[PDB]
């Protein structure tokens, strides 16, 4: 079964949730969320109505844009 | 037949953000060349810069791709 890496983020103000998981390719947004445990840690999250976006990277520049998409361009390296 | 999109370029001294209307069906690359951002910032390199796409709303049924970050928001304000 092909494996991909995904992240889930949720900003519990003054202690952020930010976790990466290895998952079976084919998993949906709802399945990743419900299988992570995030809903047990934060029982105030309501998937029927909570607002959810996805940050995708890397992408192919040939991908088709949709309403409300933001393209973020940034630098891989710091310094001065 | 149009859609509203944004393009941002984050660098150390400034955050650039611009909103555009473009033809439904446009690719990321066409949007970038169309925006004139590459003339404005000659240092942007399409093979070297990080480039990602933020999408919202999604669907709970969307199939995840490699490197997708699901962001769950707390209701405002």
């Amino acid at each position: 079964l092909n494996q991909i890496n995904i992240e889930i983020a949720y900003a519990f103000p003054e202690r952020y949730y930010l976790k990466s998981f290895q998952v079976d390719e084919g998993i949906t947004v709802q399945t990743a969320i419900t299988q992570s445990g995030i809903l047990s840690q934060f029982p105030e999250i309501d998937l029927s109505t909570n607002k959810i976006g996805i940050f995708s990277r890397p992408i192919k520049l040939t991908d088709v844009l949709k309403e409300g998409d933001r393209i973020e361009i940034y630098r891989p390296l710091l310094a001065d």
Side-chain angles (χ1 to χ4, degrees), chain A:
Chain A
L1 229 170
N2 211 260
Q3 302 291 277
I4 55 161
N5 302 100
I6 61 85
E7 298 176 305
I8 298 169
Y10 178 68
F12 182 64
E14 298 193 5
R15 189 49 258 257
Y16 298 160
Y17 180 102
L18 288 346
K19 296 217 177 152
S20 174
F21 297 95
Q22 186 187 293
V23 304
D24 305 331
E25 177 186 67
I27 188 170
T28 53
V29 176
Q30 179 183 99
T31 309
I33 299 173
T34 57
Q35 292 303 125
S36 71
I38 193 184
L39 307 173
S40 307
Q41 185 175 356
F42 304 100
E44 63 264 50
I45 291 172
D46 182 344
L47 294 185
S48 66
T49 68
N50 271 222
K51 276 136 206 309
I52 304 180
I54 283 170
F55 188 69
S56 290
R57 200 195 67 71
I59 49 137
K60 309 200 282 259
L61 301 185
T62 51
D63 286 356
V64 169
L65 291 157
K66 283 157 86 169
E67 172 63 23
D69 278 350
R70 183 192 279 184
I71 300 167
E72 296 265 0
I73 300 162
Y74 52 110
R75 325 234 277 233
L77 272 55
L78 274 18
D80 47 294

